[PDB]
Amino acid sequence: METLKITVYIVVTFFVLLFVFGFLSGDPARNP
Amino acid sequence: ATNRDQESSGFAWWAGNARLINLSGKLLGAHVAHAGLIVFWAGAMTLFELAHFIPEKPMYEQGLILIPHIATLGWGVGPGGEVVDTFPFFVVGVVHLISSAVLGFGGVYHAIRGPETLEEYSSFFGYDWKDKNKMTTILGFHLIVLGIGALLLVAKAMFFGGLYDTWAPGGGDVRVITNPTLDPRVIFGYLLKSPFGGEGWIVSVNNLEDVVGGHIWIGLICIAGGIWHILTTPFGWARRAFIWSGEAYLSYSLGALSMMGFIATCFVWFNNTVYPSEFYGPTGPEASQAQAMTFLIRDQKLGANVGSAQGPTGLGKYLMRSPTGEIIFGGETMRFWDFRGPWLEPLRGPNGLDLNKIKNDIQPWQERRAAEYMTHAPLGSLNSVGGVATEINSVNFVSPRSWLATSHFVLAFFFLVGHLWHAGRARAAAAGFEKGIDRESEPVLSMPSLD
Amino acid sequence: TTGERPFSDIITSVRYWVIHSITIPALFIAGWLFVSTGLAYDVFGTPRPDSYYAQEQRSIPLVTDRFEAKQQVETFLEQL
Amino acid sequence: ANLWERFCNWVTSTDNRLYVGWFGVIMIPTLLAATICFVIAFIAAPPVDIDGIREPVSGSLLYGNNIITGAVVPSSNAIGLHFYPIWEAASLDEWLYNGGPYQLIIFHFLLGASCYMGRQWELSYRLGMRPWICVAYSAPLASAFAVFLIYPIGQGSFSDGMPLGISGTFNFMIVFQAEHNILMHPFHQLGVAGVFGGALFCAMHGSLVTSSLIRETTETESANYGYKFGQEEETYNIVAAHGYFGRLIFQYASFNNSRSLHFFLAAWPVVGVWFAALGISTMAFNLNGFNFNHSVIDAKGNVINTWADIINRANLGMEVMHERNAHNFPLDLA
Amino acid sequence: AELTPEVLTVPLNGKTITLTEKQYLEGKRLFQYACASCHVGGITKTNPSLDLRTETLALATPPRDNIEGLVDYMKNPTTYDGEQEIAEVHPSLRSADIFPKMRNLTEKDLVAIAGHILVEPKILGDKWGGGKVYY
Amino acid sequence: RGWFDILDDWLKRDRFVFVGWSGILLFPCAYLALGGWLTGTTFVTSWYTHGLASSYLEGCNFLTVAVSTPANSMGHSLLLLWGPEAQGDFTRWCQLGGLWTFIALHGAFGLIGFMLRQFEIARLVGVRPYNAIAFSAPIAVFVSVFLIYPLGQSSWFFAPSFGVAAIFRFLLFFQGFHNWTLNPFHMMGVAGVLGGALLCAIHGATVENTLFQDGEGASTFRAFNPTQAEETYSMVTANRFWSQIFGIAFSNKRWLHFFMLFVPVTGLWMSAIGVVGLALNLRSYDFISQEIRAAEDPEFETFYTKNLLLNEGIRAWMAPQDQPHENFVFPEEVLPRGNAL
Amino acid sequence: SYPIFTVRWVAVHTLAVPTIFFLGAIAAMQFIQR
């Protein structure tokens, strides 16, 4: 438990930083 | 007569407030007349609550939501949440209601008489929605004013009377909070608190020290964020991260207000510091722990061995353990073991509730407060029958906490829907397909197949 | 578009309210005097607030018959 | 042209068979975590003590359930509203006992179905669509918000959440009516008006379009082949359906505007289920349904029972029997 | 039936006093004002042993199935055997300091709560002091 | 051109509300039933059939009013006003539940008359009679529940009553006595109704968000005149939206709208088959394999056995009040009660 | 130039004449003393 906690914590923040950066990486630009 | 049919605006009558997006004088009078409506309701309800007010009865027994807000500020209440002067309630009703005619004048003036756009008469007041530094200038002006408003609360708390403290000694009393928490590791340690049980993100603020010092911190970063947004233009990472439209900033505000309504719902439901149970009634947690206490009191008064008394299931009927190990109240109220009120901290030692502080140390004001809080739980009906859904029509009681949490959940959910409506639309509007798909240049017939 | 006078043209004509300022209040008054003069309690057999129970009796006057059931209700009503 | 602008060219691409989007970088790993944990908990979860009183409720299939009686049993009442991840527990078997799988599923499902909603926005913005299919999905999503998160928050325990199960759902419905009188709550009545109307206006619109299809085929093959996908002609006569349905009731009860028609089909179940989710979310904070118990009384003062007094005896029946051992005290506060 | 002097006759002290239809309706409201938060329907929510039934109240020490006994309870509330004194946990006129909903109860207004508590079991039946079994 | 042809002209005359041949059967009977609901919910008690207040005259509100069912002693008497039970007496007929059978039979005949109207109008406007075929699901729900279910039971008394709270009685009756949630035919109805309400909401919002831009205004409803022969929305975009959001999409607009006809109508027809079974008390009450398991194991608890404990609560707490004819005198100790409640 | 006593007149009035009668009757019920 000690290990899976920081395993999930890194997994969560990497997907969440992927969420936050990709909407910061010009989501108004990506329109037809 | 511009933007007043669908021939000139392209907006119908049911979206006719959207005809005012580019009409700065008319949109100002829309907002000042609506500001006049909120200050009217603040005034007229407070008068309605004080005209129908019994200072014998507690505030939660009277369907009062606004008299508890003035009473929390430390106005006209003394020891234990008891009204000694209803005139500070009446003034708040009169100063708001009379001010509503001034905002009602200025709302009616700018809407139906003034210049339709402010862009000609006053370049300081005239704004374009897609002018980014002007849109922070109004944001910087409004941030300083909310920094002024969050310092007025500190002023009332530190100088002009103090707020009502539920955790005053010997019961609740209006207390001048003279040593507020200026420590940012405590103020912003609330922000990193878990929302979930036992942590209770910012709803767990349980003393008026962190409240005042948190409003020194919020009240001065809003001033320093006002001076920030007055003196700067938006940076380039933010210009590509936002739609800069009138409906866009509306949607960002709607999404912010959905956060705030869902949080204030949680404040009035869980917090009994900034929403004292003297005025607002016991919380959902507070009444279930009061019921377990009343029968902890009643049965030990008949000589029950309440630590060793067992439930039907093997657990303690009065006193079991939390899953962390604290001696907590038995029954179903084991879900509410994270509840802190001031009528049971004289029971709580370091292992949870102290059994030796239950036997020879429960005061009669605590037996009185637990029996009151049990029979005034925030359970009630929509026609305001107190009690459970299977209760008979004798008790005309719904808590203000139930009224405030449910109304600000109805409002906060719709404001999330209104955010989803307006954020989707304002990004469809800035890209140019909110009115539909162009048939001559339909994107999907120019988009490749799937399989 | 079928032939009848449009509803924008009937209720807005004053001849409508020559008729209906004195028939809409008249039927609201007729319906009032159905309940206020007590005829509602007699057309349909709905009891008055002093007609659910006899003075000491508190039983439900419940029908237990089919072909001796109209006379059974009258037995409960003669009880009142 | 680093592998970030090549990464956003895959995530935001409409050429994907299933669109990912930035909301789908949260939606896919949360909902796969909420789907892998669900079917494992539905087949092999050992019995969860939901009510915190050491009486475990078998929910999974291997412990003598079928799919109808199977559930993921909600987290223990001893936990309450507490955050119970796998690392809160000392072992897995403790996490399985106290209903930790329920908190894993609903926190991954709601976070992943919230991100389904913005993914529905995001494809509408990539396709050049108008954006409000997300707003219509906010009606079932608020409902999932209510019975999994909001009604636990108001009641103070994830044991009060709806069990992820067919008969666990029916437990949740029965107990809710016993404690909150949901039938007498008008927001649930607007929700039934949203789903009965929703099913009506579905079968209405489904049958008026099917009634009005132009003959393109023979009676020796299906009328479905009169539509070829992407055709520019409307496949049914909207004037005949309005001519039909307008003569059915009266002409002005009838949407002779297809766009005004489909707004109504959109808005009636969505505002219906919005209000119904607001029913559960407001009965979270015990703002119960209409309580007409002993409302009609006679001249003496004897209670003349109503139909709402017959419901009250049924409501009493479920509430004195729900969680037969959990109550040690006479009032059911939360 | 009808609210009537046969229902409004209740024992005063071995004497009966007659309530009026104004007084019984006033003292239902003063029961719902200051008493029915705990004593809804004739039960006690904070002690479901001691219901407000006439048989329970006739069996209390001193007898509290009288109007003089219920107004003596609302000025000096005892336990069910009269030994211990509970005006610090029960609303009374000795506890205007701590039960503020008792302060405006006069001697012609407590008699209506003493009137409502005695008249109502004849009106409801087993429902007064019976609980949810008898709803 | 004789009198049948002339009456055919005037009945099928193009007017505001279309009368037709079905209007001879629809327009009195649909109006006597709805006029008799309002007459019964305003003015008629249930004090002799049920022992209830159920009119506005007694003090009930719109939720609590009903035209209550006849007494159980009536059986399945038709309860004609001239019949042997009422004997002509209108005052007696309302007390004996005669207005319930007035509404349940005129409303039965008006629903035939509305379904015949749907045939008659579709034969005159030249369209297919699928709305009549889709109206077979409210017929079968009205027929199974208000007519077939009491006919299978002992009387009209156990039919639902025409009232808001009285339907709510009937829903809570079927949970306690029939375990109607657990019945698979009701679940096909819930899947059909909620599938219909989903397909109402999805198809409504899909069309409204795939619209073609046909007008230069920001309110799109005035971009449609009905005589046009263009698709008002992009079915191609709508198919590509749902293929990547949900995985599957309609590509046939005729199959989509048949599926919208199919899903609530098959659901309400499946609920009919369950209620016809419940007329004979053929419940899916119990999974026999689990109550064998739970009766020799006192630790095997599922949510199924919890619901059955709730139904024992409903069947013993509601019935001495819900069923007054039986003279259920249940003592204060036979009542199934958990601890402390 | 229109008719006055149509079929629609009978559809309107057979509903709305007892509707107003009933609304006067339900509004008289709001003042029935108990």
Ligand code: CLA
């Ligand atoms: C309370 C919220 C609110 C507010 C503040 C406004 C404000 C406005 N609306 Mg909007 N609107 C609203 C709700 C609101 N509306 C609602 C609910 C609908 C749907 C019905 C609309 C539909 C709508 C349409 C279709 C249009 C507007 C328009 C307008 C604007 C100008 C009206 C005008 O100039 O014509 C003159 C108005 C009148 C002559 C009406 C007189 C009303 C007066 C001002 C009432 C207030 C008097 C007040 C009590 C006096 C207090 C002061 C006193 C004490 C001294 C104005 C800013 C118009 C617009 O877009 O302008 C370009 C427009 O076309 N609205």
Ligand code: HEC
């Ligand atoms: C909750 C705090 C209460 C309120 C408000 C009122 N009563 Fe009470 N009552 C309460 C308790 C806990 C008890 C039991 C006390 C004990 O001896 O252990 C009572 C008891 C009574 C009785 C005695 C009943 C009996 O069995 O003899 C009476 C007559 C009584 N209460 C009357 C009463 C009245 C008239 C009130 C309103 C003014 C009232 N009570 C308020 C709790 C509470």
Ligand SMILES: CC1=C(/C=C/C(C)=C/C=C/C(C)=C/C=C/C=C(C)/C=C/C=C(C)/C=C/C2=C(C)CCCC2(C)C)C(C)(C)CCC1
């Ligand atoms: C007063 C008080 C206090 C204090 C408080 C505080 C200090 C607060 C603060 C708070 C804060 C400080 C908060 C924050 C928040 C944040 C947010 C809310 C955010 C949001 C975000 C967003 C909105 C974003 C978006 C985006 C993305 C995601 C990506 C793309 C881009 C963008 C930008 C769009 C205390 C508790 C002590 C006590 C009580 C009283």
Ligand code: OEX
């Ligand atoms: O857990 Mn599920 O249900 Ca909500 O109420 Mn209290 O807790 Mn239990 O009883 Mn009733």
Ligand SMILES: [Fe+2]
């Ligand atoms: Fe369609």
